[PDB]
Ligand binder design. Structure first.
Ligand code: PC1
Ligand code: PC1
Ligand code: 3PE
Ligand code: 3PE
Ligand code: T2Q
Ligand code: SF4
Lengths: 318, 98, 80, 115, 70, 51, 172, 156, 105
C-alpha cells in the first residue's frame, strides 16, 4: 500500500509542476496583455508535455571540458530532493511523520544548493562558475535568517514537528502574531528558489543561463522541474506554518482543499512578483538580508523567547 | 558499538595521516582537520547515547563550535597566503630558514 | 536628540524597531504578573512517576490518596 | 524503512529519466559542438583559474552565525525547564552578543565587498 | 480572457488535493479504520507493541476490549 | 657555521620585510558577446574581471 | 539489517580515506558532505536525531564556504581526482583491501570486543527506557541554558572573539 | 497492428512535440530583430504557439538570423549553430541574411547566411512583417510535420 | 584542581556533570549509574593509589557494565555452540525462540 501512496504523492506533484509552468506562462501573458499557450491543446494543457517530450528527445551534450560525474549527478540530486521535501508534509497526514521535520526540510534545502554548485563547476564554463558563486552568495545571505525566523515561530508551537502546527493554528493563523516573520520568510523562500527578483543564479541578462548554460534537454528539464516543484513546496510550507487550514479530525479532505487553495494563491503570487519587479544585484541581496532582516530577526527572536514567559504561554512538549 | 568505534577511530587516524602528510594544497589539510572533528563528534555522540548520559550532549556541539572557529581562522590565513604568493601552496612559505 | 530619533525613524526605521523590540523583550518580563507562572507550569507537568513515600506515621502534611485534600492544587492553572 | 524506500524510489526515477535521456535520442558529436560556450567566440583561458571572492569575510562570519543558530535551536526544549530565568538571561545574552558582533563588523565595513 | 486560466489552476488544484486525501484514506484502510498511530515518544511505541502482542494477530490496530478479560 | 646546504642562505631583512617578486595580476577575461541578450546582438565587449 | 551500522561506519571510513588522499578540495568537500550524511545516519541509528541533523547542516554550510574559497584560492588548471593519479587510485584501492584484511583477520585472531562479524547487530542500543517520555537528545543540548551555563558563555565568547579575530586577520 | 502504422503515428507524435515546442535563440543582429520582438509582442504572442526565446544555444532548437551577417560575425554564428543540439533548424529572416541584401556587394558581408549554415526557410522582406515571420514559423512547423524519420529507419 | 577557584568560591561551572552518576535531565539515569556511584563512594577519602587496589572489585563491575566484554563473550560462545549443534543436528530451537511464542501480555 505504501508504494501506492508514494505514487499518489509523486505523480500529482509532477503534473502540478507541469501545469504550474502552464499557469506561469498564461498569468504572465495576461499581465503582459497577451494570451499565453492556447494552440497546442485546449487552452494550452499540452504545452508542458510537448516541452518535456521534446527535451527528452533531444541530443544531450557531453562537452570536452566537463567533469561528467558531477555534471550528471547534480540534476539527479536536484530532482531527488525536490521530490523528497514533499514526504514529511501533513495534508493533514504525512507519509513520513518526523519529529524533526523542520530540520529535515532545512538540511535537504541547504543540500539542493550543491546541485547548482557542482553543475556550474563541472560544466567548466565561466558563466556556469558565475552562477555557482552567485548561488553561494545567495545561500550565505538567506540561510542565516531562515532558521531564526523559523525558530521564532516554533517557540509558540513547541517542537520542530510539522503536525503540531495544525493544533497550534487550530483556532487562529500564525500570521497575526508573526506577520513580520511571515513577510521575511516569504522573501527568503523567494530567494531559496532562485526566483525573481532573486533569479540571479540563472540571470539571463548578465549570465546567459548561469549553471544551465552548458546543460541540455534532459538534465535541464530535471533542473527546471526541480525549481518549479520547490516553488510549490515552499508555498505549502508558508501555508502550513503561517496560514492554517481547517483541521476537523472527521474532515481531513477540507484541510487538503484549503491547503491547496492557499498554496495556489501563494504560487500565483510568486508569478505575479516575477512579472511585477526588476532583478536585484547579488550584493544588494546580502545587504538586505544582513542589514534589515537579520537585526529585526534577532529582535523578534528575543521577543518570542520572552512572550511565552511574561504570558505563561509556553507551548507543550507533545 | 565496538566495531563502530573501531571504524571511527581508524577514520580519525586516516584524517590525521592526511593532515600530517601534506601535499601542495593547504585547504585539503584543513578539510582533513574538519574530518577529524567529524569523527570525534560522532564518537562522542554515540558514546553519550549508548550511556544514556544526556548531560554530556552539550559537549559535541561545543566541539563543532570551536572546530568551525578554527576553520574560520584557517581560511583567513589562507586568504593572506594567497594574497602574498597568489596560491595556497606550502612550498612557498619556506623563507624562515634564515 | 528627538530630531535624531526622528530622522532615523524616517531614514533607518528597521534599526529603531530592532532596538525597541530588544528593550521590550528585556523589560516586559520584569513588568508582567504572569511571569511567575511559567516555571510553575513547567513544574506542574508529571513527566515522571510521583514515587510514593513510606508511611512512617509522621507525615501529616502528606496525602494518602490523590483525591485526599492535601498537597499542591492546580486551580490557579485550571482558571488562569 | 519507509523513508529509505521513498528516497531510493526518487533516486531511481531521476536515474531512469537520465538514462532514457542519454540513450533514446540520436546523437552527432563533434568538437565544435562539445566545446565550451563563451558567447560565440573561443575562451581566452580556462574557467579553472582563481575567481576572486569579495565576500570572503561575510562567508567566514556566516560560519559563526550558523553555529550561533545551532546554539539557538534547542530553545523549544529549554523553555520546558524549571530554571526559566536562567534560560531567558542566557538567550538574551547570546542574541545580544551576536548582534554586537554583527554591529562591529558592519561599522568596520566587513559586510561591504572588497572592490 | 483571464478566465482562460482556470483550467490549469483547477488541474493543479486537483493534483495537489489528491496526496492528502490519498494518504488519509490509505492510513485508515491499513490501520483498521483508524488514524496511523503516532510514535513521538517511546511510551506510545510501548503501548503499540503491547497492543500488537495482545492482539491475536501481531497488529496494533486490532483493539481488544472488555470481551477479553474473563 | 657554513655548510654545503647553507651557502645560498641569505641574512634576513632588518625589518622582517622581504623584497618579494611582484606577482602580476591575473584578471579573468570574458567575451560578454555576441549572442548575449544584454549585448544588443553584435557587441563582443571583451572585459577583465577581478571576481 | 544487523550489517547496517557497520556498513555506515565503513562508508564513513572510506569517505575519510578519500578525503585524506587530498584531491582537489572540491571532491574533498564532497567526501566530507558524504561522511557527514553517513554520520547523521549512524547517530540516528544509535538513537539521537538532533545532533545528526545539526552536524549535517553545519558541515553543509562549511563546505559551501569552502567551495567558494577553493574556486578562488585552491584551484588549478587541471584539478586532481582520485582517478587522475594512478598512485592515488592505487593507494585508495589498497586501503579498501587493507580494511577488509584487518577486519577478517581480527575477527579470527582477536577477541570479540573490537570486531565480531558473528554477533553483529546485537550491541547497538544496550539499554532503553521502554516507558519514557523525555528522552529526546535536544534535552541534553538544552541543558546548556539551564544547567551547563558555562559551556554556553564559553562558546558564545569563542564566536564573538572569532568575529573580531577574523576581521583583524583579514585587515590589509 | 502493423508496425509501419505504429511507426507513422509515433513519428506524428515526435514531430508534434518538436513542433509545438520550438525554443528559438536570442540572436538578433540588425533591424529585423525589431520585427522579431514585435512578433513576441501582444498582437502576435509567440508563446501562444509554444515559442520561447532561450538565450543558451545548448537549450535552443532554432535560430532566426535576424539581420546582416558580416565576415567578422560569421565564425560566431557558425559556432553557435554548431553548439545547438540536433534536432536544430534555421530560419533566415530578411534580405540581408538570404543574399546580403542592400549590402550584397560589400567587402564585409557574406552574400547569404546559407553559405555559413544550412537554412530550412527563407523569410523575405526588409524588414519582414512580423506577420510574415510568423507565417514562416508555421511553415517550419509544417516542414517538421513532414520529417518521417522513423519510417525511414524502419525501411532501411 | 591546579587552581581550585571553584572549590574556593563554592561554585560549580564544570564539575556537576563530569561522571555518569551526576544529575541528569528530568531525573533520568545513565546506565552503570549504581556501579559508578559505588566506585566513587569507595574511592572517597583514601586516594587513587589505594583505590586502585581496594575499589578494584567495584571498578571492574563498572567496567563490565559499561563495556560488557564478558556478556559479549558469553553470548558468542552460546551462539557458537548452538550453531555447532544445529550443524551436526543435535538441537532444535523451541517455539518461543523461532517467532512462534505466546506473546504476553
Ligand atoms: C564519497 C566520495 C568517494 C570517496 C572515494 C572515491 C571513490 C571514487 C573514486 C573513483 C574515481 C572517480 C573520479 O574521481 O573521477 C573523476 C570524475 C570527474 O569526471 P572525469 O574526469 O572522470 O571524466 C571522465 C570522462 N569519461 C567518463 C569519458 C572517462 O568524477 C567522479 O567520477 C567522482 C565524483 C565523486 C562522486 C562521489 C559520489 C558517488 C555517488 C554514487 C554514484
Ligand atoms: C517525465 C518525462 C516524460 C518525457 C519523456 C517521454 C519520451 C517518450 C517518447 C516515446 C517515443 C519513442 C520514439 C522516440 C525516438 C526518437 C529518436 C530519434 O528521433 O532517432 C531517430 C532514429 C534514426 O534511425 P536511423 O537508422 O534512420 O539513423 C540513421 C543514421 N542517421 C540518423 C545519421 C541518418 O530512429 C531510431 O532508431 C529510433 C527507433 C524508435 C524506437 C526507439 C526505442
Ligand atoms: C546515495 C546518494 C544520494 C544521497 C542523497 C539522498 C537524499 C538525501 C535526502 C536528505 C536527507 C538528509 C537528512 C537525513 C535524513 C532524515 C533523518 C530523519 O528524518 O529521521 C530518520 C527517521 C526517524 O526520525 P524521527 O522521526 O526524528 O525519530 C522518531 C521516529 N519515531 O527514520 C530513520 O531513522 C531513517 C533514516 C534514513 C534516512 C534516509 C536517508 C536515505 C539515504 C538513501 C541513499
Ligand atoms: C608513512 C610512509 C610514507 C611512505 C613514503 C611515501 C611518500 C609519500 O607519498 O608521501 C607524500 C604524499 C604527497 O606526495 P606529493 O606531494 O603529492 O608528490 C607526488 C608523490 N610522488 O603524501 C600523500 O600522498 C598523502 C597520503 C595520506 C593518505 C594516506 C592513506 C593511505 C591509505 C592506506
Ligand atoms: C517573456 S515571458 O515573461 O513570457 C517568459 C516567462 C517564462 N516562460 C516560461 C515559463 C515556464 C516554462 C517555459 C518553457 N520552458 C519549459 C522547460 C521544461 N519543462 C519541463 C517539464 C518537465 C516535465 C513536465 O511534466 C511531465 F512531463 F509530465 F513530467 C512538464 C514540463 N522540462 O523543461 C524549460 C525551459 C522553458 O523555458 C517558459 C515564458 C517566457
Ligand atoms: S533586411 Fe532590411 S530590415 Fe532586415 S536587417 Fe537587413 S536592412 Fe535591416
Amino acid at each position: 500500500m505504501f508504494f501506492i501512496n508514494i505514487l499518489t504523492l509523486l505523480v500529482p506533484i509532477l503534473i502540478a509542476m507541469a501545469f504550474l509552468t502552464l499557469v506561469e506562462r498564461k498569468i504572465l501573458g495576461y499581465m503582459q496583455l497577451r494570451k499565453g499557450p492556447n494552440i497546442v491543446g485546449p487552452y494550452g494543457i499540452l504545452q508542458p508535455f510537448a516541452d518535456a517530450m521534446k527535451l527528452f528527445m533531444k541530443e544531450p551534450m557531453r562537452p570536452l571540458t566537463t567533469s561528467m560525474s558531477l555534471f550528471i549527478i547534480a540534476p539527479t540530486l536536484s530532482l531527488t530532493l525536490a521530490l523528497s521535501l514533499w514526504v514529511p508534509l501533513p495534508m493533514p497526514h504525512p507519509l513520513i511523520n518526523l519529529n524533526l521535520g523542520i530540520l529535515f526540510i532545512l538540511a535537504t534545502s541547504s543540500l539542493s544548493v550543491y546541485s547548482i554548485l557542482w553543475s556550474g563547476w563541472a560544466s567548466n564554463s565561466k558563466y556556469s562558475l558565475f552562477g555557482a558563486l552567485r548561488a553561494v552568495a545567495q545561500t550565505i545571505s538567506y540561510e542565516v535568517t531562515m532558521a531564526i525566523i523559523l525558530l521564532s515561530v516554533l517557540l509558540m508551537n513547541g517542537s520542530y514537528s510539522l503536525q503540531t502546527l495544525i493544533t497550534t493554528q487550530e483556532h487562529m493563523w500564525l500570521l497575526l502574531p508573526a506577520w513580520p516573520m511571515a513577510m521575511m520568510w516569504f522573501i527568503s523562500t523567494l530567494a531559496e528558489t532562485n526566483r525573481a527578483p532573486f533569479d540571479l543564479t540563472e540571470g539571463e541578462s548578465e549570465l546567459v543561463s548561469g549553471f544551465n548554460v552548458e546543460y541540455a534537454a534532459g538534465p535541464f528539464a530535471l533542473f527546471f522541474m526541480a525549481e518549479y516543484t520547490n516553488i510549490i513546496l515552499m508555498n505549502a510550507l508558508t501555508t502550513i506554518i503561517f496560514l492554517g487550514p481547517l483541521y476537523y479530525i472527521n474532515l481531513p479532505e477540507l484541510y487538503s482543499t484549503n491547503f491547496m487553495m492557499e498554496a495556489l494563491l501563494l504560487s500565483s503570487t510568486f508569478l505575479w512578483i516575477r512579472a511585477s519587479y526588476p532583478r536585484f544585484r547579488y550584493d544588494q541581496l546580502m545587504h538586505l538580508l544582513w542589514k534589515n532582516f537579520l537585526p529585526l530577526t534577532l529582535a523578534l527572536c528575543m521577543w518570542h523567547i520572552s512572550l511565552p514567559i511574561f504570558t505563561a504561554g509556553v507551548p507543550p512538549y507533545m | 558499538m565496538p566495531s563502530t568505534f573501531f571504524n571511527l577511530t581508524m577514520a580519525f587516524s586516516l584524517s590525521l595521516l592526511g593532515t600530517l602528510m601534506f601535499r601542495s594544497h593547504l585547504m585539503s589539510t584543513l578539510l582533513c582537520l574538519e574530518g577529524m572533528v567529524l569523527s570525534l563528534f560522532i564518537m562522542t555522540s554515540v558514546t553519550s547515547l549508548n550511556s544514556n548520559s544526556m548531560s554530556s550532549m552539550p559537549i559535541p556541539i561545543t566541539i563543532l563550535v570551536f572546530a568551525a572557529c578554527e576553520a574560520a581562522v584557517g581560511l583567513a590565513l589562507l586568504v593572506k597566503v594567497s594574497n602574498t604568493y597568489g596560491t595556497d601552496y606550502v612550498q612557498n612559505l619556506n623563507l624562515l630558514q634564515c | 536628540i528627538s530630531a535624531f530619533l526622528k530622522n532615523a525613524w524616517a531614514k533607518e526605521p528597521v534599526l529603531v524597531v530592532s532596538f525597541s523590540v530588544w528593550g521590550l523583550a528585556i523589560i516586559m518580563p520584569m513588568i508582567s504578573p504572569y511571569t511567575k507562572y511559567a516555571s510553575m507550569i513547567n513544574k506542574a507537568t508529571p513527566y515522571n512517576y510521583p514515587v510514593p513515600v513510606r508511611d512512617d506515621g509522621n507525615m501529616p502534611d502528606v496525602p494518602s490518596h490523590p483525591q485526599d485534600p492535601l498537597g499542591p492544587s492546580l486551580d490557579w492553572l485550571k482558571n488562569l | 524503512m519507509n523513508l529509505y524506500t521513498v528516497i531510493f524510489i526518487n533516486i531511481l526515477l531521476s536515474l531512469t529519466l537520465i538514462l532514457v535521456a542519454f540513450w533514446l535520442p540520436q546523437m552527432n558529436l563533434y568538437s565544435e559542438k562539445a566545446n565550451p560556450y563563451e558567447c560565440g567566440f573561443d575562451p581566452t583561458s580556462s574557467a579553472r583559474l582563481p575567481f576572486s571572492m569579495k565576500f570572503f569575510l561575510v562567508a567566514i562570519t556566516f560560519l559563526l552565525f550558523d553555529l550561533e543558530i545551532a546554539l539557538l535551536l534547542p530553545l523549544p526544549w529549554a523553555i520546558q525547564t524549571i530554571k526559566t530565568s536562567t534560560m531567558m538571561i542566557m538567550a538574551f545574552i547570546l542574541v545580544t552578543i551576536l548582534s554586537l558582533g554583527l554591529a562591529y563588523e558592519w561599522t568596520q565595513k566587513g559586510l561591504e565587498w572588497t572592490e | 480572457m483571464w478566465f482562460e486560466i482556470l483550467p490549469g489552476l483547477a488541474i493543479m488544484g486537483v493534483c495537489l488535493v489528491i496526496p492528502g486525501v490519498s494518504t488519509a484514506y490509505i492510513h485508515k484502510f491499513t490501520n483498521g479504520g483508524k488514524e496511523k498511530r503516532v510514535a513521538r515518544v517511546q511510551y506510545q511505541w510501548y503501548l503499540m507493541e503491547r497492543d500488537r502482542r495482545i492482539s491475536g494477530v501481531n497488529r496494533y490496530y486490532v483493539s481488544k476490549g472488555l470481551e477479553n478479560i474473563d | 657555521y657554513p655548510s654545503k646546504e647553507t651557502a645560498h642562505w641569505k641574512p634576513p631583512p632588518w625589518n622582517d620585510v622581504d623584497i618579494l617578486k611582484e606577482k602580476a595580476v591575473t584578471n579573468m577575461t570574458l567575451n560578454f558577446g555576441p549572442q548575449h541578450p544584454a549585448a544588443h546582438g553584435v557587441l563582443r565587449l571583451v572585459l577583465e574581471l577581478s571576481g | 539489517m544487523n550489517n547496517y551500522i557497520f556498513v555506515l561506519s565503513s562508508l564513513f571510513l572510506v569517505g575519510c580515506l578519500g578525503l585524506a588522499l587530498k584531491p582537489s578540495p572540491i571532491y574533498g568537500g564532497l567526501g566530507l558532505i558524504v561522511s557527514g550524511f553517513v554520520g547523521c545516519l549512524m547517530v540516528l541509528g544509535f538513537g539521537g536525531s538532533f545532533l545528526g541533523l545539526m552536524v549535517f547542516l553545519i558541515y553543509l554550510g562549511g563546505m559551501l564556504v569552502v567551495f567558494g574559497y577553493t574556486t578562488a584560492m585552491a584551484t588549478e588548471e587541471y584539478p586532481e581526482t582520485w582517478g587522475s593519479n594512478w598512485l592515488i587510485l592505487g593507494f585508495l584501492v589498497l586501503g579498501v583491501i587493507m580494511e577488509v584484511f584487518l577486519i577478517c583477520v581480527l575477527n579470527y585472531y582477536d577477541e570479540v570486543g573490537v570486531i565480531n562479524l558473528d554477533g553483529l547487530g546485537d550491541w547497538l542500543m544496550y539499554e532503553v527506557d521502554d516507558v519514557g517520555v523525555m528522552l529526546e537528545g535536544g534535552i541534553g543540548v538544552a541543558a546548556m541554558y539551564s544547567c551547563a551555563t558555562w559551556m554556553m558563555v564559553v562558546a558564545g565568547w569563542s564566536l564573538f572573539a572569532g568575529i573580531f579575530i577574523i576581521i583583524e586577520i583579514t585587515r590589509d | 497492428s502493423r508496425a509501419e502504422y505504429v511507426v507513422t503515428k509515433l513519428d506524428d507524435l515526435i514531430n508534434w512535440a518538436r513542433r509545438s515546442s520550438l525554443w528559438p535563440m536570442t540572436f538578433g543582429l540588425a533591424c529585423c530583430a525589431v520585427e522579431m520582438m514585435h512578433m513576441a509582442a501582444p498582437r502576435y504572442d509567440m508563446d501562444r504557439f509554444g515559442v520561447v526565446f532561450r538565450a543558451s544555444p545548448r537549450q535552443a532548437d532554432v535560430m532566426i538570423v535576424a539581420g546582416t551577417l558580416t565576415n567578422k560575425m560569421a565564425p560566431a554564428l557558425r559556432k553557435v549553430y554548431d553548439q545547438m543540439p540536433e534536432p536544430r533548424y534555421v530560419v533566415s529572416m530578411g534580405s540581408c541574411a538570404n543574399g546580403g541584401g542592400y549590402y550584397h556587394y560589400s567587402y564585409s558581408v557574406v552574400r547569404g547566411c546559407d553559405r555559413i549554415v544550412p537554412v530550412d526557410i527563407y523569410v523575405p522582406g526588409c524588414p519582414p512583417t512580423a506577420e510574415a515571420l510568423l507565417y514562416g514559423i508555421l511553415q517550419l512547423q509544417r516542414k517538421i510535420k513532414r520529417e518521417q524519420k522513423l519510417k525511414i529507419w524502419y525501411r532501411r | 584542581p591546579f587552581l581550585d577557584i571553584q572549590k574556593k568560591l563554592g561554585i560549580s561551572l564544570d564539575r556537576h556533570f563530569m561522571f555518569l552518576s551526576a544529575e541528569q535531565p528530568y531525573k533520568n539515569a545513565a546506565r552503570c549509574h549504581a556501579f559508578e556511584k559505588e566506585w566513587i563512594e569507595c574511592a572517597h577519602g583514601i586516594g587513587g593509589t589505594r583505590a586502585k587496589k581496594e575499589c578494584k572489585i567495584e571498578f571492574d563491575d563498572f567496567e563490565e557494565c559499561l563495556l560488557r566484554y564478558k556478556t559479549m563473550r558469553r553470548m558468542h560462545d552460546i551462539k557458537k555452540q548452538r550453531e555447532k549443534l544445529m550443524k551436526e543436528g543435535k538441537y532444535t530451537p523451541p517455539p518461543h525462540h523461532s517467532g512462534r511464542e505466546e506473546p504476553r501480555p
